[PDB]
Scaffold this active site. Structure first.
Site, PDB file in Angstrom:
ATOM      1  N   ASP A   1       0.597  -1.033   0.212  1.00  0.00           N
ATOM      2  CA  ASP A   1       0.093  -0.488   0.061  1.00  0.00           C
ATOM      3  C   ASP A   1       0.795   0.906  -0.171  1.00  0.00           C
ATOM      4  O   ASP A   1       1.950   0.943   0.510  1.00  0.00           O
ATOM      5  CB  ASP A   1      -0.898   0.104   0.965  1.00  0.00           C
ATOM      6  CG  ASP A   1      -1.492   1.229   1.757  1.00  0.00           C
ATOM      7  OD1 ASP A   1      -1.557   1.756   2.637  1.00  0.00           O
ATOM      8  OD2 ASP A   1      -2.755   1.235   0.838  1.00  0.00           O
ATOM      9  N   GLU A  15       1.995  -1.103  -4.837  1.00  0.00           N
ATOM     10  CA  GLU A  15       0.617  -0.097  -5.234  1.00  0.00           C
ATOM     11  C   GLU A  15       1.735   1.823  -5.882  1.00  0.00           C
ATOM     12  O   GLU A  15       1.116   2.214  -4.327  1.00  0.00           O
ATOM     13  CB  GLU A  15      -0.462   0.216  -4.563  1.00  0.00           C
ATOM     14  CG  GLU A  15      -1.554   1.272  -5.163  1.00  0.00           C
ATOM     15  CD  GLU A  15      -1.266   2.405  -4.130  1.00  0.00           C
ATOM     16  OE1 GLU A  15      -2.837   2.685  -4.822  1.00  0.00           O
ATOM     17  OE2 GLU A  15      -0.781   3.158  -3.906  1.00  0.00           O
TER      18      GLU A  15
HETATM   19  O1  LIG Z   1      -7.630  10.265   8.796  1.00  0.00           O
HETATM   20  C1  LIG Z   1      -6.319  10.829   7.920  1.00  0.00           C
HETATM   21  C2  LIG Z   1      -7.504  11.241   6.700  1.00  0.00           C
HETATM   22  O2  LIG Z   1      -8.094   9.571   6.725  1.00  0.00           O
HETATM   23  C3  LIG Z   1      -8.985   9.726   5.332  1.00  0.00           C
HETATM   24  O3  LIG Z   1      -8.233   9.388   3.712  1.00  0.00           O
HETATM   25  C4  LIG Z   1      -8.163   7.895   3.190  1.00  0.00           C
HETATM   26  C5  LIG Z   1      -8.308   8.186   1.812  1.00  0.00           C
HETATM   27  O4  LIG Z   1      -9.804   9.254   1.502  1.00  0.00           O
HETATM   28  C6  LIG Z   1      -8.522   7.396   1.683  1.00  0.00           C
HETATM   29  O5  LIG Z   1      -8.769   7.352   0.013  1.00  0.00           O
HETATM   30  C7  LIG Z   1      -7.470   5.790   1.919  1.00  0.00           C
HETATM   31  O6  LIG Z   1      -6.522   5.839   0.952  1.00  0.00           O
HETATM   32  C8  LIG Z   1      -6.347   4.805   0.589  1.00  0.00           C
HETATM   33  C9  LIG Z   1      -5.904   4.318  -0.448  1.00  0.00           C
HETATM   34  O7  LIG Z   1      -7.025   3.601  -0.240  1.00  0.00           O
HETATM   35  C10 LIG Z   1      -4.960   2.948  -0.645  1.00  0.00           C
HETATM   36  O8  LIG Z   1      -4.573   2.474  -2.206  1.00  0.00           O
HETATM   37  C11 LIG Z   1      -3.535   4.092  -1.011  1.00  0.00           C
HETATM   38  O9  LIG Z   1      -2.720   3.468  -1.042  1.00  0.00           O
HETATM   39  O10 LIG Z   1      -2.996   4.534   0.060  1.00  0.00           O
HETATM   40  C12 LIG Z   1      -4.207   5.402   0.604  1.00  0.00           C
HETATM   41  C13 LIG Z   1      -4.112   5.655   2.549  1.00  0.00           C
HETATM   42  O11 LIG Z   1      -3.509   4.720   3.240  1.00  0.00           O
HETATM   43  O12 LIG Z   1      -7.379   5.703   2.958  1.00  0.00           O
HETATM   44  C14 LIG Z   1      -7.337   7.539   3.777  1.00  0.00           C
HETATM   45  C15 LIG Z   1      -6.897   6.556   4.942  1.00  0.00           C
HETATM   46  O13 LIG Z   1      -8.152   6.524   6.377  1.00  0.00           O
HETATM   47  C16 LIG Z   1      -9.542  11.083   5.109  1.00  0.00           C
HETATM   48  O14 LIG Z   1     -10.410  10.713   3.629  1.00  0.00           O
HETATM   49  C17 LIG Z   1      -8.552  12.095   5.067  1.00  0.00           C
HETATM   50  O15 LIG Z   1      -9.769  13.265   5.152  1.00  0.00           O
HETATM   51  C18 LIG Z   1      -8.431  12.452   6.324  1.00  0.00           C
HETATM   52  O16 LIG Z   1      -7.358  13.561   6.444  1.00  0.00           O
HETATM   53 CL   LIG Z   2      -4.474  -1.023  -5.818  1.00  0.00          CL
END
Ligand SMILES: OC[C@H]1O[C@H](O[C@H]2[C@H](O)[C@@H](O)[C@@H](O[C@H]3[C@H](O)[C@@H](O)[C@H](O)O[C@@H]3CO)O[C@@H]2CO)[C@H](O)[C@@H](O)[C@@H]1O
Ligand SMILES: [Cl-]
Ligand SMILES: OC[C@H]1O[C@H](O[C@H]2[C@H](O)[C@@H](O)[C@@H](O[C@H]3[C@H](O)[C@@H](O)[C@H](O)O[C@@H]3CO)O[C@@H]2CO)[C@H](O)[C@@H](O)[C@@H]1O
Ligand SMILES: OC[C@H]1O[C@H](O[C@H]2[C@H](O)[C@@H](O)[C@H](O)O[C@@H]2CO)[C@H](O)[C@@H](O)[C@@H]1O
Ligand SMILES: [Ca+2]
Length: 496
Positions: free
Chosen positions: A197, A233
């Site tokens: 991730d 990723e």
């Molecule tokens: O409180 C911290 C923040 O949490 C939230 O962020 C979310 C994202 O909105 C969401 O898209 C997801 O991001 C991950 C994604 O799915 C993954 O494929 C990528 O590789 O890594 C990302 C992080 O691991 O998850 C995050 C975290 O919960 C919230 O939307 C934001 O406003 C906050 O600031």
């Molecule tokens: Cl992915």
């Protein structure tokens, strides 16, 4: 780290997004095993912080609080049971490893976590790991906000907070080791590999240091000396500071250009046409095939504002989606990952879905089981695209033609194309607003083949369209632009 480690002949993995361990275990036995699926990408199995605002979004699972295998998908016993049962029927498990960060820096202190572990985000305390302030990148980040302000600077992208997430100090051997211990436990349990991730937010060298500490796969199911499959990723649509190629030395990388470009083409946007797909793959500026993990859509971008934006095709656009997925599964480029989703109430305001946070089907926070209907579809709002005949049969198609070269390409100069895989498979598409009626060279031995898109070979007959291939390998394909599924696919195992 490049070999998928699926059982020989199995060429795809399916992302069973937000599915519980017990449902995945049953799915491996009743469906994935028998239907030739290579494996399953599971949601993060480690403990995450509970998010009550909004109420239990899917994304709370990307905010780790510990490495305990305790989530809404299940506990450790259930996780182990799933890995064992799936491996026993030849279906691998690939873990979504969230290692670049812990939870949001703005989160409250307490035990409002999936396993009840305590954490104090404000003071960077994660006693269940354990991690303390010394284990985060707060001082290393040079931006005034402490977050990523510019993607044009590789340093802040890697050292600063991604959307407020506490950034782990991945340069430290203590942190690298803590992560490796979690991953090694998973490997010993039976996991075949990992989806790394947010790899773009970590230095390729730091990831390498973690990977170098990993155990070989469990010999109860894998040959001795087997290294875990690694697919990082990294969202790289080109034209930016960080490139996917920077991660080629660690294992495979997600090729996000794949679904973005394919979706645009199939939708016929920006003047794109299917005939342009003749040189699909590196010809389109993609990474080498042997370094790629491809897909039409993923859990992020299927929501409309991820890599690819609105061009990304999803289950919501079923007809075109099956065409895109079919093209992908037939084409030799990359290692294929099929998406499996759940429905949610979309509400687009100003072009963006404000309900994109909606978590999996649940009863007051408890994820619903996956019910199987008599027609093989799923209940409880689990879409189960991997169960659609058109997708299931193309997964089998890929296995059948494994190792065969791209051959016999044909196109009408617009949106009607066709190609085969050596002498084992052939596929024809009509994405134009008019009739397709042509006699094409399939490269296949003469005989009668069942179209696996409209039906199946049952005994000595076909339930759908039949394709009569001449002694010279040619066959007529007549596909109306009004057909529910404007494509036909035949292979060695669908032959009567
Ligand atoms: O409180 C911290 C923040 O949490 C939230 O962020 C979310 C994202 O909105 C969401 O898209 C997801 O991001 C991950 C994604 O799915 C993954 O494929 C990528 O590789 O890594 C990302 C992080 O691991 O998850 C995050 C975290 O919960 C919230 O939307 C934001 O406003 C906050 O600031
Ligand atoms: Cl992915
Ligand atoms: O090779 C690197 C580039 O590959 C990709 O480009 C695609 C184009 O997106 C697609 O339009 C098509 O280009 C045709 C062009 O539209 C037409 O005017 C001309 O006559 O024929 C072109 C060839 O078919 O095909 C190319 C790939 O061959 C990718 O989209 C791009 O970002 C890369 O830089
Ligand atoms: O294999 C089970 C059924 O799958 C397909 O139905 C899909 C359809 O193709 C898709 O457009 C829609 O979104 O979902 C359904 C299943 O929910 C086949 O068309 C059916 O004949 C199969 O029974
Ligand atoms: Ca980082």
């Amino acid at each position: 780290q490049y070999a998928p480690q699926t059982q020989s002949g199995r060429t795809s993995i399916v992302h069973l997004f937000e599915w519980r361990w017990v449902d995945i275990a049953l799915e491996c036995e009743r469906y994935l095993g028998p239907k030739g699926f290579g494996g399953v990408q599971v949601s993060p199995p480690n403990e995450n912080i509970v998010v009550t605002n909004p109420s239990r979004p899917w994304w709370e699972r990307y905010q780790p609080v510990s490495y305990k295998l305790c989530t809404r998908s299940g506990n450790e016993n259930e996780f182990r049971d799933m890995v064992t049962r799936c491996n026993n029927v030849g279906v691998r498990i690939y873990v979504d490893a969230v290692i670049n960060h812990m939870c949001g820096s703005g989160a409250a202190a307490g035990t409002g976590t999936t396993c009840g572990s305590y954490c104090n985000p404000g003071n960077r305390e994660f006693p269940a790991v354990p991690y303390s302030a010394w284990d985060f990148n707060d001082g290393k980040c040079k931006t005034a906000s402490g977050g990523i302000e510019s993607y044009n600077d590789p340093y802040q992208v890697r050292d600063c907070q991604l959307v407020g997430l506490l950034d782990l100090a991945l340069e430290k051997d203590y942190v690298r080791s803590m992560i490796a211990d979690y991953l090694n436990k998973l490997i010993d349990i039976g996991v075949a590999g990992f989806r790394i991730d947010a790899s773009k937010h970590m230095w390729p060298g730091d990831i390498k240091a973690v990977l170098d500490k990993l155990h070989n796969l469990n010999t109860n199911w894998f040959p001795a000396g087997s290294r875990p499959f690694i697919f990082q990723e990294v969202i790289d649509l080109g034209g930016e500071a960080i490139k996917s190629s920077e991660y080629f030395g660690n294992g495979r990388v997600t090729e996000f250009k794949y679904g973005a470009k394919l979706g645009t083409v199939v939708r016929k946007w920006s003047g794109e046409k299917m005939s342009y797909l003749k040189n699909w793959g590196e010809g389109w500026g993609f990474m080498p095939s042997d370094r790629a993990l491809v897909f039409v859509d993923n859990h992020d971008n299927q929501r409309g504002h991820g890599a690819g934006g609105s061009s990304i095709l999803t289950f919501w656009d079923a007809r075109l989606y099956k065409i895109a997925v079919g093209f992908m599964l037939a084409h030799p480029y990359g290692f294929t990952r099929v998406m499996s989703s759940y429905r949610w109430a979309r509400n687009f305001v100003n072009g963006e879905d404000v309900n994109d946070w909606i978590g999996p089907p649940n009863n007051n926070g408890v994820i619903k089981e996956v019910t199987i209907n008599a027609d093989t579809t799923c209940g409880n709002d689990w879409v189960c695209e991997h169960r659609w005949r058109e997708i299931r049969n193309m997964v089998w198609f890929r296995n059948v033609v494994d190792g065969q070269p791209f051959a016999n390409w044909w196109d009408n100069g617009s949106n009607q194309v066709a190609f085969g895989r050596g002498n084992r498979g052939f596929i024809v598409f009509n994405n134009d607003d008019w009739q397709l009626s042509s006699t094409l060279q399939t490269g296949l031995p003469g005989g009668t083949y069942c179209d696996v898109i409209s039906g199946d070979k049952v005994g000595n007959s076909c339930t759908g369209i039949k394709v009569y291939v001449s002694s010279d390998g040619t066959a007529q394909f007549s596909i109306s632009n009004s057909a529910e599924d404007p494509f036909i696919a035949i292979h060695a195992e669908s032959k009567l």
